[PDB]
From Swiss-Prot:
This is Protein-arginine-phosphatase. Belongs to the low molecular weight phosphotyrosine protein phosphatase family. The lineage of its organism: Bacteria, Bacillati, Bacillota, Bacilli, Bacillales. One of its GO terms (molecular function) is protein arginine phosphatase activity. The keyword Hydrolase applies. Efficiently inhibited by Cu(2+) ion, Zn(2+) ion, sodium pyrophosphate and N-ethylmaleimide, while the addition of Mg(2+), Ca(2+) or Fe(3+) ions has minimal effect. Inhibited in a competitive manner by vanadate. Optimum pH is 5.5 with pNPP as substrate. It catalyses: N(omega)-phospho-L-arginyl-[protein] + H2O = L-arginyl-[protein] + phosphate. It is an enzyme of class 3 (hydrolase). Induction: Expression is up-regulated in the exponential phase of growth, followed by a significant and gradual reduction in the stationary/sporulation phase. Is not up-regulated during ethanol stress. Catalyzes the specific dephosphorylation of phosphoarginine residues in a large number of proteins. Counteracts the protein arginine kinase McsB in vivo. Can dephosphorylate CtsR-P; thus, can restore the DNA-binding ability of the CtsR repressor by reversing the McsB-mediated phosphorylation. Is the only active pArg phosphatase present in B.subtilis. Exhibits almost no activity against pSer, pThr, or pTyr peptides. Appears to play a role in B.subtilis stress resistance. Substrate binds at residues 8-13.
Amino acid sequence: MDIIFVCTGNTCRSPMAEALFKSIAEREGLNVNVRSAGVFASPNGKATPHAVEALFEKHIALNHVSSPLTEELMESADLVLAMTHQHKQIIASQFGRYRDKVFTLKEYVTGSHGDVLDPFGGSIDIYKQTRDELEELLRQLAKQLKKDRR
């Protein structure tokens, strides 16, 4: 499968998810291709320092290059997981042909609507908490995706 995680600028939540998930999938023997993008991202940049530091504590390197969402990405993806419901709607407004691939990470995993709240500009600990929440969802996701024959 090809899956993409989406946040606002592709500097914090989605890159963290992308790195955490690749590591988890490897541990689980899940073969999957993982990417990330932002609804409003610059392609300019990298992950925020706190985002990098939070992963570092977990022995995961987050060497990231930010990217906006593109047709190439949306087309190829099997699944697209937004951090928040608003991200999901915005994505749908811009890539209407692909709406059916798009769910929030929490609704897809947990069956209930929820958002992964924005940590941008927050302390290192805000980022750590965000990392922990993603990690918990992602472990559940890896188990689910393993049951996907794609």
